[PDB]
């Protein structure tokens, strides 16, 4: 149908916007701490601690399959990156501290993303 096409164009454009959001958030992680899944070879107990691992590469795979229907779903995954790290790692670690900085700096980007998503519809 024409409606299904219009819906699909909307999703494509959301994907475009979320791709720019993802790039901006990932720039706030210059150390690349969050770039890839925590290695289960190197952290064999990880899934005993963290039930829903997340990382920027995994988000990018979902994004490119158009697997984010709305900004809430995308934000859920970003918050998992931060929150998983802040539980597994102690406050006095470079990992915890990187997550705090990513949360703080990402807030700004996500605030305007939400306005853009609502504005453009």
Curated annotation (Swiss-Prot):
Lineage top rank: taxon: Eukaryota
Expression by tissue: Highly expressed in testis.
Subcellular location field: Nucleus; Chromosome
Disulphide connectivity of cysteines: none
Subunit organization: Component of some HBO1 complex composed of KAT7/HBO1, MEAF6, ING4 and BRD1/BRPF2. Component of the MOZ/MORF complex composed at least of ING5, KAT6A, KAT6B, MEAF6 and one of BRPF1, BRD1/BRPF2 and BRPF3. Interacts (via PHD-type zinc finger domain) with unmodified histone H3. Interacts (via PWWP domain) with dimethylated and trimethylated 'Lys-79' on histone H3.
Function: Scaffold subunit of various histone acetyltransferase (HAT) complexes, such as the MOZ/MORF and HBO1 complexes, that acts as a regulator of hematopoiesis. Plays a key role in HBO1 complex by directing KAT7/HBO1 specificity towards histone H3 'Lys-14' acetylation (H3K14ac), thereby promoting erythroid differentiation.
Protein name per UniProt: Bromodomain-containing protein 1
Natural source organism: Homo sapiens
Portion of the full sequence shown: 555 to 674 of 1058
